Each structure stands twice: as C-alpha cells, then as structure tokens.
Amino acid sequence: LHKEPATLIKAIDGDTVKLMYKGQPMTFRLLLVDTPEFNEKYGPEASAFTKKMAENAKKIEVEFDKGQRTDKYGRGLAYIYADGKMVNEALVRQGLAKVAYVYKGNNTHEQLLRKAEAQAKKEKLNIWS
Numbered sequence: 001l002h003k004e005p006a007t008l009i010k011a012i013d014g015d016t017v018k019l020m021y022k023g024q025p026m027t028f029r030l031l032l033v034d035t036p037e038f039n040e041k042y043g044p045e046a047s048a049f050t051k052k053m054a055e056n057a058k059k060i061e062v063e064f065d066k067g068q069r070t071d072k073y074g075r076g077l078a079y080i081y082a083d084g085k086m087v088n089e090a091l092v093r094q095g096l097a098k099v100a101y102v103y104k105g106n107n108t109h110e111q112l113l114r115k116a117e118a119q120a121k122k123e124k125l126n127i128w129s
C-alpha cells in the first residue's frame with residue numbers, strides 16, 4: 001500500500017472527511033471502522049476527535065487498500081493519516097469507533113485495528129465504558 005498526498009477541505013463527522021485528492025474534492029469514508037452517528041452517544045466526541053486530528057495535521061495522507069476505492073455512495077474508501085498517525089487506528093484505540101465493515105480485499109490493516117480495539121475495550125474506554 002502507498003500513501004498519497006491530500007488536503008483537508010472539511011471535517012464531516014467521526015469517520016468521514018472531505019479532502020482534496022489529486023485536485024478534486026471528495027468525501028472519504030474511513031476503512032474498517034464505524035463511529036456513532038452525531039445524534040448517538042459518543043457521536044459528538046468521535047466527530048470532535050477526527051476534526052481536531054485532521055485540522056491540526058500539517059500533512060494529511062490517503063492510503064487505498066488493494067480492493068475497491070469508492071463505495072456505492074461515491075465516497076473514497078481509505079486509511080487516512082494525519083502527520084503519520086492513522087486516524088482509523090486512533091479512533092478505535094480511543095474507543096470512539098468499533099472495527100466494522102471488514103470486506104475481503106480491503107482488509108490490510110484489520111489485525112492492527114483489532115489489536116487497538118482490544119486495548120480500548122480492556123481499558124473500558126468511551127464506547128466500551
């Protein structure tokens with residue numbers, strides 16, 4: 001897998017961000033994770049976490065997996081990095097997302113995220129509290 005440059009246009013919620021990628025705007029949906037919706041418990045905290053992570057970053061990168069790069073709603077599917085730190089993994093490690101939507105062929109970072117979920121759960125963090 002390879003990291004590609006992109007720039008934040010706007011944070012949207014816990015697991016979706018609008019980025020400029022190859023000079024076109026697109027909504028990216030974070031691979032392998034599921035945050036609460038804004039109206040649900042921890043929804044606002046997941047949104048605020050992803051917003052601060054993305055907005056604070058000097059450099060945002062997108063990393064596609066081996067499989068489909070857009071979903072059925074035309075959203076990009078990627079691992080997103082903020083100054084080298086994976087947002088997907090970070091949300092999970094904080095108990096602000098569950099591992100979810102694991103489809104064959106786009107699952108390269110599954111065990112890494114599962115490892116992070118295990119530790120958030122062990123710590124009784126947020127969603128796991």
Ligand SMILES: Cc1cn([C@H]2C[C@H](OP(=O)(O)O)[C@@H](COP(=O)(O)O)O2)c(=O)[nH]c1=O
Binds near residue numbers: 031033
């Ligand atoms: C994360 C991800 C979501 N999706 C689709 C599955 C779900 O379809 P359905 O909308 O029919 O339930 C939806 C969940 O996205 P959200 O969690 O953003 O709502 O997005 C993919 O198809 N591939 C993916 O990798």
Ligand SMILES: [Ca+2]
Binds near residue numbers: 015034
């Ligand atoms: Ca969601």
